[PDB]
Every structure is written in C-alpha cells, then in structure tokens.
Homo-oligomer: A and B are copies of this chain.
Amino acid sequence: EFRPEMLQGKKVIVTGASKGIGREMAYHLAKMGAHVVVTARSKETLQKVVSHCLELGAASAHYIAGTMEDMTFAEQFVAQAGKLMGGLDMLILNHITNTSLNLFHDDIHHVRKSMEVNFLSYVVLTVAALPMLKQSNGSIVVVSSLAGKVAYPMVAAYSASKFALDGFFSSIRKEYSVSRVNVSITLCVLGLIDTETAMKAVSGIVHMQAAPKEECALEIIKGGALRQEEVYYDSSLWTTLLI
C-alpha cells in the first residue's frame, strides 16, 4: 500500500520533465517532499517547473538542460544530478524525441533518431545511474506505451524503440535478479494520456477518452515506489494486455 511519505527526502531524477507527464511527475514528487533534478532541452520552462516544485515543497529542486541525442550529455547529466542531491534513489526515464503519425517510407533518419533518443539514451542514463542506485537500493522507472507492447500503424520507428525498451530492461531485470542486485525496474505501459503532444497527434482518429496526465504521473510514481515490475495506465489496459 503506497503512501506519500515513501518519497519524502528521496532523491529523484525525472527526464522529459519540462511538460506533459514528466512535469506532473516532478510536481507530485515535490508535493511529497522528494528532492528533484529535472531535465529537458528547454531552460526557461525547466526553471518554471523548478520554482513551482519549491513552492509545492520539494526538499530541493534543480534543472539541467540538454538534449538526450547527445550521449555525453546523458552520462554527465547523471553524474551532475546525483552530485546536486548527494545521491540517487529513483531514475525516471520519460523523455521522447518528437514523433508524429506518418506512414513509413524511407526515413531511416527518423528511425535511427527514435532509437537513439527513446532507447539508447535510456541505456546510457541507466549505466551512469547504476552505481548510485546500487548503494541506495533504488529504482528505475521506464516509461513506455501500449504501442511498445502491441504494434500500431503510422508509428513504426516509435514502436521499434519502445519494444526495444521492453526487450532490454526486462532482460536486465532477470540479470539483476540472478546477480543479487537490489535495484528495481518498473516498465510503464501507457494508453492515451491527455498531454498536448498526444492530443495534437490524435485529433484525426477515433479514440476513447484520454486519461488525465496528473493521475497518470501519480500512478507511475506509485508503481516505482512500490517496486512493481510493470504499471498499466489507465488501469483498464491491464485487462487488455493480459487478454
């Protein structure tokens, strides 16, 4: 049974946190009394999230801006975050490269960049974070998609990258299990969440009610805190994916 005090004084990194689900997550952590280090590319907007986080009562809150295309930024970012907080209890990998509904023809560039940002950078961040997570018996949260479990048209490169996440992280979870590494891995399968990005994307299709990003963010946090292997949001997916 989750309680907010579980996050109190915890040292959390949230990526892709200038907007959408990431920013809701940071705000939730702040309200709970965690320390937070947020990142995205956009300085001014990260500062907005930081000051609001402080207002909500974050134990502490800092941003570091950069792109997750740059693997050197990824490594460095982690080193520098753990330093600001003096440690690391939870790594929330949430960011994603810009993607719209397109049929696949010849855009290998988009395919490689999707894999780099949505997947490769998650591996680099994990490798960098692992020493701190080991010492704190901490937690990794990887944010994926129903289209990382079931394939959909018009998002081939995206699905490839989200599938890759399932492939990699579930595998290292079995490895951490056999190697007695006390670091949890939570994979989040999300449906349609009402972020501006996702709603812009789906204006042209028939879909069910998008789920609120505030609640989505909360259920992610809860799942990671409780060290659940997989989180389904909205909850009615849980029945889909297992039937």
Contacts and interface: CB of A to CB of B under 8 A. Distances in A.
Contacts of A165: 160
A199 interface: no
A160 B171 contact: yes
Contacts of A106: 127
A175 interface: yes
A174 B160 contact: no
Given A115-B115, A123-B111, A127-B106, A168 B159 contact: yes
A156 B172 contact: yes
A204 interface: no
Nearest to A123: B111
A154 interface: yes
Contacts of A167: 148, 151, 156, 159-164
Interface residues of A, number: 42
Contacts of A153: 171-172, 174-175, 177-178
Interface string A140-169: 000000011001111111011111111110
A127 B155 contact: no
A115 B156 contact: no
A112 to B, nearest CB: 6
Interface in A97-132: 103-106, 108, 111-112, 115, 119-120, 123-124, 127
A171 B152 CA distance: 5
A170 interface: yes
A93 to B, nearest CB: 14
A15 to B, nearest CB: 17
Contacts of A163: 163-164, 166-168
